[PDB]
Amino acid sequence: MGQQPGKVLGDQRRPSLPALHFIKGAGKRESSRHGGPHCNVFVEHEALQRPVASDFEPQGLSEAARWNSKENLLAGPSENDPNLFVALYDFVASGDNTLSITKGEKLRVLGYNHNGEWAEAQTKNGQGWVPSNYITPVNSLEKHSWYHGPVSRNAAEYLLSSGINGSFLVRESESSPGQRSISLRYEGRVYHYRINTASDGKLYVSSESRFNTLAELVHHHSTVADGLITTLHYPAPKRNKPTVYGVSPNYDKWE
């Protein structure tokens, strides 16, 4: 059919249409085992960290029900591609031009917008823009539930208010970059340990055990009690899903 379509005009101005949409769309298991052999508590799954509650024995241990991502801790770079990202939160596409991401899914960022709030990204769900604050590279510490980043001590109390025996998190001070703490709740009390950053860039709570990465810090301190009251048992999850206001991500003209 020899008809001439209205394909594309050219360069235009930016209008103000606030695209907004929500729906309950999450549920993915990218799950495995790492272990960390020592004392038990009273819970059931795979991975030799804490032995099972002796009433039920479906697998014999317990870790993967609380933290399956413990093998992504010392995974290093991503599975094959060093620039692969992962979804921190399950996010619903606000518009058609944005993308619905599932929590814990490995997705690919292509590039951020003018102010770096949103990125053209691709999931198994399709294509579209997703925000920085709902994703992170698989190379980072942020991909782990325990790492919350900018958290005041009161917000860490709030995080560990519903925390069990051995619950933990790493916070960084928004008011003091580089200064970090491990808030570990055990026996119904929240304790706070200093992550001392050595001059060359090493991390350590304890002066005796200095690691290259905070990943090795959490590993070594989840296997053994190394200056903690107990082993890093349960990672405290994220507190807030960051509220994004009225954004067209980059797309006014975007192809």
Cβ atoms 75, 89 nearer than 8 A = no
Angstrom distance (rounded) from CA 130 to CA 132: 7
Angstrom distance (rounded) from CA 49 to CA 26: 28
Domains, in order of start, for the chain: 1-139 (no CATH), 140-255 (3.30.505.10)
Angstrom distance (rounded) from CA 24 to CA 46: 28
- Looking only at the bridges linking them, the beta strands covering 234-235 and 147-150 are unpaired
Sheet strand arrangement including 106-112: 126-131, 118-123, 106-112, 85-87, 135-137
Cβ atoms 192, 153 nearer than 8 A = yes
Count helices and strands in the chain by DSSP H and E runs: 2, 11
The dihedral over CA atoms of 76, 82, 88, 91, expressed in degrees to the nearest 10, equals: -160
Angstrom distance (rounded) from CA 39 to CA 225: 11
Q: 184: which 2 tokens?
A: 């570990």
Angstrom distance (rounded) from CA 51 to CA 222: 14
Q: How was this structure determined?
A: NMR
Measured in whole angstroms, the distance separating CA 44 from the mean position of its chain's CA atoms is 23
Cβ atoms 155, 144 nearer than 8 A = no
What amino acid is encoded at 210 in this protein?
R
Phi and psi dihedrals of 247, rounded to 5? -80, 125
Q: Which of 247, 255, 252, 237 is nearest to 93 (CA)?
A: 247
3-state secondary structure of 220: helix
What amino acid is encoded at 128 in this protein?
G
Burial of residue 223 (number of CB atoms within 10 Å: 0-12, 13-18, 19+): middle
Residue owning tokens 């200095």: 210
Q: 164: which 2 tokens?
A: 């069990």
